[PDB]
A paper describes a structure:
The bifunctional enzyme proline utilization A ([name]) catalyzes the two-step oxidation of L-proline to L-glutamate using proline dehydrogenase (PRODH) and L-glutamate-γ-semialdehyde dehydrogenase (GSALDH) domains. The two active sites are 42 Å apart and connected by a buried tunnel that is hypothesized to channel the intermediates Δ1-pyrroline-5-carboxylate (P5C) and/or L-glutamate-γ-semialdehyde (GSAL). The PRODH active site is located in a (βα)8 barrel, while the GSALDH module features Rossmann NAD+-binding and catalytic domains, which are both characteristic of the ALDH superfamily. Kinetic and conventional X-ray crystallography of [name] from [name] (SmPutA) were used to capture high resolution (1.47–1.88 Å) structures of states along the catalytic cycle, including a novel FADH−-proline covalent adduct in the PRODH site, the intermediate P5C bound noncovalently in the reduced PRODH active site, the covalent acyl-enzyme intermediate of the GSALDH reaction, and noncovalent complexes of GSAL and the final product L-glutamate in the GSALDH active site.
The structure of the acyl-enzyme intermediate was captured by soaking crystals of the E810A variant in 40 mM L-proline, 1 mM Coenzyme Q1, and 1 mM NAD+ for 24 h and then flash-cooling the crystal in liquid nitrogen. Glu810 is the conserved glutamate in the GSALDH active site that facilitates hydrolysis of the acyl-enzyme intermediate, and mutation to Ala is expected to slow the hydrolysis step, allowing the acyl-enzyme intermediate to build up. The structure of the acyl-enzyme intermediate was resolved at 1.74 Å resolution. Electron density clearly showed the presence of a covalent modification of Cys844 in chain A. The electron density is consistent with the acyl-enzyme intermediate, which was modeled with occupancy of 0.83. Electron density for the coenzyme, either NAD+ or NADH, was also observed (occupancy of 1.0 in both chains). Given that the coenzyme is in the pose typical for NAD+, we have modeled it as NAD+. Interestingly, the ion pair gate is open in the noncovalent GSAL complex and closed in the acyl-enzyme.
Author numbering: 14 to 78, 83 to 134, 137 to 491, 494 to 1230
Amino acid sequence: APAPFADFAPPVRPQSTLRRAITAAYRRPETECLPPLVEAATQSKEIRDAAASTARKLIEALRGKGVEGLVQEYSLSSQEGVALMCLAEALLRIPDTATRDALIRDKIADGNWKSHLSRSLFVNAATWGLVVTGKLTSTVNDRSLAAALTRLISRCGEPVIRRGVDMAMRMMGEQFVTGETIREALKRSKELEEKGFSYSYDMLGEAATTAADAERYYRDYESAIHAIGKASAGRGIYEGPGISIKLSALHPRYSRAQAARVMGELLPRVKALALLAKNYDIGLNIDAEEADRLELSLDLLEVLCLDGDLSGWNGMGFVVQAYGKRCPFVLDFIIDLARRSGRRIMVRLVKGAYWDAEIKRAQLDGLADFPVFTRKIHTDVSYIACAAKLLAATDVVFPQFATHNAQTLAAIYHMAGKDFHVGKYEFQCLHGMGEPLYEEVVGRGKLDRPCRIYAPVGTHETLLAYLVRRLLGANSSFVHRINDPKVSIDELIADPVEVVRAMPVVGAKHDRIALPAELFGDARTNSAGLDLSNEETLASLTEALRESAAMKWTALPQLATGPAAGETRTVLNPGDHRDVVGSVTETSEEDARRAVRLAADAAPDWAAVPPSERAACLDRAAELMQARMPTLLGLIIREAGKSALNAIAEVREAIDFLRYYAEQTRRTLGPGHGPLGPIVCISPWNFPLAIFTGQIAAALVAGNPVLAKPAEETPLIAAEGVRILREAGIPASALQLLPGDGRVGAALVAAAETAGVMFTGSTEVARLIQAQLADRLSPAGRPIPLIAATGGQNAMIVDSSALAEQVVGDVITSAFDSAGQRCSALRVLCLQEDVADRILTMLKGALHELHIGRTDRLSVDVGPVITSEAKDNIEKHIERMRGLGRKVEQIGLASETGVGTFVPPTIIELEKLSDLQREVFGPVLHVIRYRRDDLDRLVDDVNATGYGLTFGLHTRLDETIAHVTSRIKAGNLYINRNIIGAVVGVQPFGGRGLSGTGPKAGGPLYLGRLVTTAPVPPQHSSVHTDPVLLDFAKWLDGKGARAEAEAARNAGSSSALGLDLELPGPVGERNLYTLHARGRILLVPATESGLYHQLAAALATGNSVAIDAASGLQASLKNLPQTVGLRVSWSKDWAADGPFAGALVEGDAERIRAVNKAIAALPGPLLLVQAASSGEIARNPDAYCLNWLVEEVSASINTAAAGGNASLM
Ligand SMILES: Cc1cc2c(cc1C)N(C[C@H](O)[C@H](O)[C@H](O)COP(=O)(O)OP(=O)(O)OC[C@H]1O[C@@H](n3cnc4c(N)ncnc43)[C@H](O)[C@@H]1O)c1[nH]c(=O)[nH]c(=O)c1N2
Ligand SMILES: NC(=O)c1ccc[n+]([C@@H]2O[C@H](COP(=O)([O-])OP(=O)(O)OC[C@H]3O[C@@H](n4cnc5c(N)ncnc54)[C@H](O)[C@@H]3O)[C@@H](O)[C@H]2O)c1
Ligand SMILES: *C(=O)CC[C@H](N)C(=O)O
Ligand SMILES: [Mg+2]
């Protein structure tokens, strides 16, 4: 068999000294990067004065030389302007100019435009918003825009419509693009080519999703090289036109993880285009993209420049991004490569276009620092220093200075000195934007320095795809400052080098941008990830992973008295059974019962450890796991079948649980919050470290000793987690490990001294535990608390406003990551009928680009399922659907998978959602289509499964967001992003119905469930009072029940219903946390006062009730106000009147036990039950705790989804 990790992530080539200098600078501190940049960018006082003069002379011409004018002519509001442009865009999608004018004249200008024009008019309004207002809104308020469009048409008629159409036509055909086609762009370029300009054409392709998209982009590029070469007609690479390409357009898996495919499949295609450009002797420039593709692209640039088939041509070009901390070392490397190869490489120096996306990515991944600067002035100094380096090597490279900043331009112009010849260097600008400035530079009558115009080419659809990124003209852009008339010229010709030099601390990070580790401020330290695009990281990880596979991992029954003997068997890698991972010794049912007794007898000693010291253990346990992360990664990869990327996330999530529960402890717990006692923690195989650790850390920090029962498939990583927690100071008596199967779990739950159970697993097993536990009562006569986190049937809804490329990406990740073995995984994709065929073609194309196999290779996307039984179960489902006529799409599996348990990613097209009647825990996406008027019915079908865990929605339309998020009943919502990877303390995780009891893991109510008296969580309060509660309290006052009326009003104030908070997280995301009503609560009263207390508790938290008619208390609620009676029903057959969302029970100990057994028999969800005796209701106003009568909802909205980040102005 192949040696573990012997082929994890070998580099494309051995890393030269010059390449190593690049990698070493990836995330270098910003205070280290600047001093050498300032040294390099300095110039004589004489030069700086001449620079500021030239830069002032340029800026004064500009100030002395469209959509705004339209808004003025018709006195449009901002929303009218935006809506008018969306209307124009949709009228231009009408091809025949005469048909269009007839629709305007006879139907639009008069009738409701809403009849004549399956896709909102306002799909692109975020982009038109930028045009009109200069500000970017992530989503579209389509009801506001509809009203504005009606208003402006009813006011001004066909004339305003005509003017909108012509404006949009001019902007889309001549301003945003030089032309719609390359032939048209070439015809339009004649005029400025005569005035001394040159051109390079950008064909607006990028981010291929399928093989078909990449082939299409390739032939687009090929056919443009022909038109450009023919038009060039021998002018050469400096005077004549060239083309610019993006590598992500030519392959659907352009990434370091797929480097072998990139060199074998993408390189040959770039070489064939370059050969064509060589024959016409035109430039071919490789555009720069995200920071994690930079070094990968250098390997393509190296091979192309050493390829003798391309010799004799100096047209190959390459962009370098000055906002990147690697820029000067990249330039050293290129300059040396130009010397070795003898190719005069065309180096286009830009600042960079992905800034806010890079900030968000680094934060999300928990990396050590950013790969770009965080102050714009730092990018300027870097640009000017790299320009000096490039102007010293014009013998071997051709520098191309792409900038619109007049201060940068003047600096470069004077730095280059008096000698110039065409071919020494050039400036560059963007079509429609930079000509005014550079019409003051080009020509013998100005500065006599040439400028290449970068010219987008594309249809309306194409230009709009990333027209937002191109606009971002933000609060720090030179283009934005030259307009702003409160900015003086003296301000605009300020020298960035001298300003940075005289700052108190050179190169300081931006004050308002958090390093990834500091995302949560003083609350806690963020866990740290690893950069799998960093060759140094991959190299050192390769060795640690190899060394992890040599260990003899074991897991034993670690009882309080010491290791126990038992039945021993191997643990095999699910991706290859020949790979023995370790040995597990499993627990006898006798030692299971014995461990509970030792924990019971040791419980007082652990409760007596002060909360702050308990949390301090957890903080030490977090630090141990961060240090051992590489070794833990390797065990999770091989024991549980996970990819390295999913193993990193899992170890982070364990670290985060430990620090989050430690901080929550420091915020809440005191002497009056006593532990429950021994808690049994039972966990699933699919997050074998994270969920394992989170349940145990919570229970322990709340003062409870713990019996940890790991899933039988993943004991080894569990045993390691317990080793670490004990090393951190958890005493052996406080944390005992009991490996084994469901019998060991069932014996622990049943044991006499078990005070609480934390279960994560399947819904049916949680139903068996609930049944065990209804037989039992605590020594105080109350039910044994149960937290059950169970399965999901998670849907995503996509309408015709979504961007297919974003959707396919989020779907492929949500459904097939970890082979779909996430409780959160996407199970049902719901596609609006108009875009269903297009998205499904893309999805299937992207499916076939996934790599399935054993997960000790970075190249693997989808690993094995955990066992042969899981495989057989998943494959039964697939073949059933296949036998019912449903279209089934499956990738092909390589024969190497036969040594493991694999299921291929699978797409199944269903007719109705009720076709699918059970959670299928594998890589199996079901697809259904819906018509837009049936959206509300669709949300019902989603809710009707009974599950309620994760849910996703892709739309740009506020009315659809409002509608859908107010009707879906699920605990974790996701807008315009994937639906997996909830982050501790940011998206507190957990659902409702068949998906769990709550409270949410990694949320502020979790610890309260594990003590006898719940504390008040941080920020847990609400100023809102439920109005039916208030009517009930008045009814009680009317009936003479003064004391109960007062209790009712106190419950109204104590309720946290309506709490609405935003939680700190990464930039580019809004993460919200809210408390809602749970639903209909089953009330089982014994006395009239008991019923009034129960009803006040339920109403104060927004719930309706079903009251046990067998109680005989019907006459205690005569003459209810109508508002309260709407919320009240009576029930004789509890099972018929479900599903309920909780229960309140009054009785003595045996009444409680009987009612509890009858509630556990109700079909459907596990109910969170609270019981109290009549005397407890009288003595304790919190006998029924309001924390468990509300439902937590987490929502995460990707606010960078329109293409940029507004807040990072
Ligand atoms: C001809 C041509 C061709 C291209 C490009 C430009 C031109 C003129 N660009 C885009 C370029 O990188 C840049 O985004 C804009 O052109 C604006 O730069 P200026 O010098 O015009 O303006 P300006 O001088 O106002 O500089 C603005 C720039 O500063 C940076 N910035 C803003 N805030 C910052 C902060 N807080 N911290 C650090 N930096 C900050 C950004 O890079 C921003 O673009 C590009 N880009 C790319 O990545 N790949 C490519 O292939 C191209 N192609
Ligand atoms: N809501 C969540 O946060 C969440 C997270 C992960 C997984 N899950 C769910 O867990 C399931 C997959 O994991 P699984 O296959 O390991 O679950 P499972 O129900 O098969 O097994 C879970 C655990 O319970 C034990 N067990 C089995 N029978 C038992 C019994 N009669 N009494 C006591 N313990 C018993 C097992 O040994 C194991 O430790 C899926 O349904 C998935 O959706 C939910
Ligand atoms: C379920 O398996 C846990 C999944 C995790 N919380 C996530 O991916 O959100
Ligand atoms: Mg099982």
